[PDB]
Structure 1
Amino acid sequence: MRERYELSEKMLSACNLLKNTINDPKALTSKDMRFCLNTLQHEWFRVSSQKSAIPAMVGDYIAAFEAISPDVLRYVINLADGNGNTALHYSVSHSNFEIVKLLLDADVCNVDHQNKAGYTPIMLAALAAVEAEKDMRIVEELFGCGDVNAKASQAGQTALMLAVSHGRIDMVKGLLACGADVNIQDDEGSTALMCASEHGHVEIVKLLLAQPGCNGHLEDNDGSTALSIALEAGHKDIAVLLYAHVNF
């Protein structure tokens, strides 16, 4: 058997103090707890969220928190820093998918939490570097735990739109396969399909078009369709694919 990483004395102390005040909102927001809570947060982010975070150490911390109290586990895992980021945001963004998996396994993450920038961990996953087959299953696990159709505070973009705009075909297939709606329009009326036509992703256009109920007729706020956009972007091959679709 492997000897588990233990919480630092500062962290154990803070967590035991938290356990004893967590159900008392007066105590929790008081001056007397401020140093405790800052220490708690400081330690958790140092251990869980740096690029060089040790996955085993994070997993052992999670177990240690649960053993102290399930309420302590929920509390720490869901801490957001001053950028509004949780450990789930940072671990998705650093492509540290071992840690992403350990966090989902705790079954307490607020996976729909929007950071200050306005994005959820699912949106961040759309742009993350996925190297292995194992990692994509972890990503699809993430998609299944949250709302894949949530809209960013910035322009109302979805994870699907972000994945399309980057040409990440792996990722688009994942989102679609976990229930991402093709027809959602951002704040300006733009669809995923329109994103695909701006960026010239012919393979992604074919994939979106192949989805049941994919609407090529939708117009953005200035009456532009995917077809009208495609022609202006110079993408003849996309335009003929789009034209055949809206006239099938």
Structure 2
Amino acid sequence: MAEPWGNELASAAARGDLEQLTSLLQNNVNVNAQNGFGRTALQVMKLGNPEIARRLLLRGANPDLKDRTGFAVIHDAARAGFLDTLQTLLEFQADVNIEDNEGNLPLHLAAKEGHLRVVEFLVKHTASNVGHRNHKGDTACDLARLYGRNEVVSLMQANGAGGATNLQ
């Protein structure tokens, strides 16, 4: 077949089809393809399973495969609440600092949705987005905060990630 990634990938990949990706991978796949949508199965990848991207990441799935809204698959991994999937991104060195089409990043998303245990992962491993201030500067702390989510705020604020830079 002459269709690397794109439909086939984003299809099974973003359809939860785990093996479908393997069979297609062992056969052939634009590790970095990107339909006119500006996305690759690594971005759509049914975040339900986080290995979804892994199957692609093992061959080369840039976790910061941004999209139209500057959303990196990391966004998707966290924004929706797929930490183990957000991990597939970290495992494969995904820009924990990856952002959107302005500045906010997947740590501010889980912060807006309230994905505490999730945003808790970015502050637990990866490079975390402590002072990661978005375009204006509402970093991932000014995000889970403005949206009310405090356990998400304290998560970073307490983890020296919510501003508060007083060390003396």
Same fold by TM-score greater than 0.5: yes
Residue type at the aligned position of 2:69? A
Residue type at the aligned position of 2:3? N
CA distance 1:139–1:193, shift in 2 (3 Å): closer
DSSP 3-state at the match of 2:29: coil
CA distance 1:212–1:172, shift in 2 (3 Å): closer
Superposed CA offset, 1:6-63 (max 9, x none): xxxxxxxxxxxxxxxxxxxxxxxxxxxxxxxxxxxxxxxxxxxxxxxxxxxxxxxxxx
Aligned length: 161
Superposed CA offset, 1:49-102 (max 9, x none): xxxxxxxxxxxxxxxxxxxxxxxxxxx24268xxxx331221212222222111
Match 1:168 to one of 82, 95, 109: 82
CA distance 1:240–1:144, shift in 2 (3 Å): same
CA distance 1:198–1:114, shift in 2 (3 Å): same
Matched, 1:120 2:40: yes
Distance 1:138 1:194 in 2: 23
Partner of 1:149: 64
DSSP 3-state at the match of 1:166: helix
Q: CA deviation at 1:206?
A: 1.1
Distance 1:234 1:138 in 2: 32
Matched, 1:215 2:129: yes
CA distance 1:156–1:204, shift in 2 (3 Å): same
Q: Is the 8 A contact 1:92 1:124 kept in 2?
A: yes
Partner of 2:31: 111
DSSP 3-state at the match of 1:186: coil
Q: Is the 8 A contact 1:140 1:174 kept in 2?
A: yes
Identity of aligned residues (%): 26
Q: CA deviation at 1:190?
A: 0.9
Task: Mark the structure with the bigger radius of gyration.
Answer: 1
Superposed CA offset, 1:115-143 (max 9, x none): 12221110111x4443xxxxx54641212
Q: Which has the higher helix share?
A: 1
5+ residue gaps, structure 1, are: 1-75, 131-135
Q: How well do the aligned residues superpose, as a CA RMSD in angstroms?
A: 2.1
Q: Is the 8 A contact 1:77 1:87 kept in 2?
A: no
5+ residue gaps, structure 2, are: none
TM-score, normalised to structure 2's length? 0.84
Map residues 40-79 of structure 1 onto 2, 5 A cutoff.
76-78=1-3
Distance 2:81 2:47 in 1: 12
Q: CA deviation at 1:105?
A: 0.6
Residue type at the aligned position of 1:206? E
139-148 or 114-123, larger mean C-alpha shift: 139-148
Residue type at the aligned position of 2:65? A
